[PDB]
Amino acid sequence: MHLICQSGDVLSARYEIVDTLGEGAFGKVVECIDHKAGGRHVAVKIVKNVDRYCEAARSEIQVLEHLNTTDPNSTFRCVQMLEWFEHHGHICIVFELLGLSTYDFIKENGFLPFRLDHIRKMAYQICKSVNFLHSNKLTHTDLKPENILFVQSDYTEAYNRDERTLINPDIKVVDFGSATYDDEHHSTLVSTRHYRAPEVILALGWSQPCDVWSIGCILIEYYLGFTVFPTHDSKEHLAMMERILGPLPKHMIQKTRKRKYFHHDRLDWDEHSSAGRYVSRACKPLKEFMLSQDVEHERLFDLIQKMLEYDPAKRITLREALKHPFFDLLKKSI
Ligand SMILES: CCOC(=O)c1c(/C(C#N)=C\N)c2ccc(Cl)c(Cl)c2n1C
């Protein structure tokens, strides 16, 4: 990877690297000048020459070919792939250039949260975009702030501490290397995720509702500046869920084969261990995280609580979420 992604490198006799935009498990994304398209700047995803990542890259190309044909005007804000190629045996995917991920923006803003009016706009676009995937028999599976990118991340600064505020909070959804079609094999074992929906943890089967769970988690991270599930251990994750959302439904405990998380009818969790003391400190009931009691904060948290419904059947769908009162302020002027 290190050998093929330096600035000044030319890819496919066409794309001149000018900058590195980010790095992930898959490899790296660089910014390039497209010399065969009039010097337009593009993003190029350079994928590790590793079997699992190559496989995911080929899968992402097929998804993106389908999405871009289905939505040629980009009306639903999925990232637009321009083409793909191979470079020294590495799969390279060319994208329209986008701005900073929402995760990177929060980080460069000192972990300050987004203003509520920007959260509302961003949440609406994310719901509309992922609902478009759900309408086409797809599940994203890896929604997280790092995979939501601002179209353009220019900002202004002002004293409140010092805050950056987006000039335009338009976003797109990216990273389709994990997206899965309904009729495709769904991994009952799911790798590392920033957010773990409970049906994924408990191996009860998953589909489009696990995206809604992730979006609820995204929204509370936008509101707080940090995740309410600061963990990568699955049992700790379930312990955090119980503290924030209440006990897991007995019908899900009854059905799961993940008996390693359980003892009798309840989570097998030692509240006085190192992890236990941390969970007790770091987590609390969802609505205690509210920073205001104003009605538009209540509206946001009502939506978040519906998205964080344990049972994925009962959980709100994105089509329903787009009709939630939190979004009424975006509706047509009377
Ligand atoms: C985890 C690092 O991913 C990125 O840095 C990233 C990513 C990915 C991927 N795949 C995930 N954040 C991008 C996808 C499309 C476009 Cl246009 C851009 Cl510019 C992307 N960037 C900068």
Side-chain angles (χ1 to χ4, degrees), residues 7 29 71-72 81 89 99 132 136 138 145 213 215 251 275 296 305 308:
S7 58
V29 181
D71 179 17
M81 174 183 71
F132 163 70
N136 289 284
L138 277 159
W213 176 276
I215 293 166
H251 76 265
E296 282 288 346
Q305 178 174 71
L308 300 188

Side-chain angles (χ1 to χ4, degrees), residues 20-30 42-45 60 79-80 93-101 104 144-149 173-177:
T20 296
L21 295 178
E23 302 190 15
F26 55 77
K28 171 189 294 200
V29 181
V30 294
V42 298
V44 182
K45 181 166 174 179
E60 171 172 41
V79 66
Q80 179 185 343
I93 311 171
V94 188
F95 296 106
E96 60 168 320
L97 185 57
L98 299 172
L100 219 50
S101 84
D104 280 306
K144 61 187 171 165
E146 202 164 22
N147 287 340
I148 309 293
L149 269 56
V173 175
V174 308
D175 199 333
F176 294 88

